[PDB]
Each structure stands twice: as structure tokens, then as C-alpha cells.
Amino acid sequence: NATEIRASVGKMIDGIGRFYIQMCTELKLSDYEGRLIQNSLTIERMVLSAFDTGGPIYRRVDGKWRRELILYDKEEIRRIWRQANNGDDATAGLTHMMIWHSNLNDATYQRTRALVRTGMDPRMCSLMQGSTLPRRSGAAGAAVKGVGTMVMELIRMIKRGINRRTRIAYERMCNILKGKFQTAAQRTMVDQVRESRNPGNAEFEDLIFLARSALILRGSVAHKSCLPACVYGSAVASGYDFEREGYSLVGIDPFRLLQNSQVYSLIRPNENPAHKSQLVWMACHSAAFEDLRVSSFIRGTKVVPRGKLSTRGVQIASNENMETMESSTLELRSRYWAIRTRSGGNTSSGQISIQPTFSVQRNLPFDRPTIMAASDMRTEIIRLMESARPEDVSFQGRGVFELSDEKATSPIVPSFDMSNEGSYFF
């Protein structure tokens, strides 16, 4: 059903576009100045703030870039927003930029200070997908969250409490949690946790376990390709009428859109442009915890690790100066594309006999034992954990698609026998 899903999300994309265009028309920015991921960001945040203000706005004068510090009627912003969405709220829309920010933050920064202070191992990076993502995020906003993300929450919710309506949260927060797991025990052990009203260190210690189980027996976490407002604004302005032509966040749509985007970015004096583009590109698909090998494969070019990356962050701090500041054109094109997945990969009182109702060749079942016959769920997992090898192939048969292959017709299988450059962005 490509009607609602493909076109309703198109309508949410149109809103962001239209709005970005309106908002650019207010600031009286130029074309080059509306394509500046910097300014786009500021605008996006102005809005999410107002629906839950001012910001840094960079201008282009003969030669050099001028930063303007401006403020807007928090309500005016809310007004212009609905105007674009037909006077609707389009929470989806705000939530969308709510993620674009997330996915950018999960790649620009490493959130160790918080994991440890929670009592999670800093090496649990690949499980903190969407830790920055405000709770206000929607229902399809949390689905993007990593297993580890959920744990940091409950643990704090629990840690301060164990140190009214708050209950329905906890159970649900676990149900979601549990819905991340895709194996018997995993699933069952989550329940054993959700049993305690005042879950103390008993739970505190157990979920942390399950956190680590996901490092091996991963869960289902959705990835959403959420591009900057400018990209959608520019697209809308170019005629693309997504609600009519359909759009996706996990298909070929987002890559294709980025195949023509003209996004520019402010770049500090000693920073590497190629390195800058990489960053943004990884935020456009939630590839901050992906295997660098595959990221580079699909990317088309080296996807260098965070440490070796030359850049501190895309936003410009009030500290810096404009004199020594210039801007480059971000390389967001990719070689192939791939279905952004959700899956993490993987490798009595009852009846005892069957009463036959039809005449067919059928082995008739009965439980030989029970008839003639007259522990720690951790263990289960630890035992599963074990048989697991890092070489264990996932998404068997799934491949990569050419950018011409609009339909999911012909898949391509990558062979990594190659002089790679690592697998852990962090």
C-alpha cells in the first residue's frame, strides 16, 4: 500500500519544504545563503523550540561571511509553520527534524560522559542510537532508538526513584525495549525485569546485562534517512511535489534526493572539506554506528573513522570568529543505496495428542513421554551469546542497489575481501 504511507509522508515532507522556503523569504536570504546547512539548522531549531526564539544566521558579503544573531516571535514561527502545513500541526514534521538533528548528533559526538555516569560501559556506543532525541519525539520517533538508548533512561528514571502515573511509562518503556529484542530469552527476560514496582539494583544490574546481549544478539532498530530542512525546501521549490509523487525515509527516495542537493557548509580554516561532507552524509542516513566497510562501500569513497576525522562540529560556536572562516560544497552523493533496515540479524495444561478430522496420509502426533510417563534466563542468553561468531553472515541474500534501480528489482552483493580501513566509526 503505496498510497497512505508513501504519499502521507510526502505531505509531511512538503510541509518542511514550503516552511523552509517561507522562512528563508523572511530572513531575506539568498539562494546560496539558503543552502547553507548552517542557516538551515538554526531555522530548524527555532521551530522545534517554539513548538516545545532566535539563533545564529550567517550572511554573505563581498568576500567574507557575516554571522547575525537574530530573534523571532516564538509564535510568529508557530504561525508560519502551520501556514505551510495547512494549519495542521504535523507533529511528524517537527519530529522529522527532531531526528535529523538526532542522527547528526549521534555521528558528530560520542556520549561517554553520560553512559558511565549512568553505569553503562562506554564501549556500548553502537546501542545509543537516539540518546539525544527528546522524549517529545513521536511513536515512530522512538522506533529509531537503540537498545542501549532505552536502558540509559529507565536506569535514570529508576536510579533517582529507587534512590504516580510514572508507572505506565516504565512498563511501556520496557515493552518497546522488549520489542527491540528478536529472540525468545531476550524477549522473556525483559518481562522478568518489568515485574518489579520498585525495581532496584536487581533490575539495574540485569538490564545492563541485556544491554550487552544486544552487542551480540542485536535487536530491531529502524533507521530513518532524515535530510536537513534546506534539502527539502530546495526540492519543494524545484517543483517536486512529494505528496503527489510519493517519498520514503528508508527507500531510494532519500538517496535520490541527495543526488542533486546543492548543500553548502561553513568550514573552519584547518578543516578538511572531504571530511566535512563525510560527517553530514553519515547523519543523513543514521550510519554513525554502521560498519565503516559497508558505509564506504555504498558511499563510493573512503568513510574515515571518527578519530581520523578532521572536524569538531558542523555548528559554529559564538567563540569563533568569522574573519578566518570560509565555506565548502558538501559532497552528499553516494555510489549505491540500500534498504535502511530495522532488523539486527540472527543465526503443561495443553494438548498431547491430535484427534483426526480428515482422511489423509498423516503421522498422527502424540507426546510419547508425558503420556506413558504414568533457571536463570541469563544462562539462556549467555549460551546463545557464545555460539555467535562475528563472522556470522546477516541479511542473507540482501544487497545494494544501483541508483538507477528505482524498483527494488536487482540486488548486488558486496564482497569485502579488500584493503579496508576499520569497522568501528568510534
Author numbering: 21 to 72, 92 to 202, 213 to 396, 402 to 428, 438 to 489
What's the paper's own text on this?
The native ribonucleoprotein (RNP) particles are formed by the association of these single-stranded RNAs to multiple monomers of nucleoprotein (NP) and a single copy of the polymerase, a heterotrimer composed by the PB1, PB2 and PA subunits. Such RNPs are independent molecular machines responsible for transcription and replication of each virus gene. To better understand how these processes take place we have determined the three-dimensional structure of a model ribonucleoprotein particle that only contains 248 nucleotides of virus RNA but is biologically active in vitro and in vivo.
The three-dimensional reconstruction obtained by imposing 9-fold symmetry lacked information about the polymerase complex but could achieve better resolution for the NP ring. We also carried out a docking of the atomic structure of the NP in the cryo-EM reconstruction. However, additional masses are observed at the top and at the bottom of each NP monomer. We propose that the extra mass at the top of the NP monomer corresponds to the protein sequences not solved in the crystal structure while that at the bottom may contain genomic RNA. The interaction among NP monomers is conserved in the NP docking presented here, with the only need to alter the angle between NP monomers from about 120° in the crystal to 40° in the RNP volume. This interaction interface would be more realistic, as no NP trimeric structure has been described in natural virus RNPs, and would imply a small change in the arrangement of the connections between the loop and the body of the NP (positions 428–438 and 396–402). The model obtained is compatible with the interaction mode proposed earlier and further indicated that additional side-by-side interactions are now possible due to the tighter packing of the monomers (black arrow).
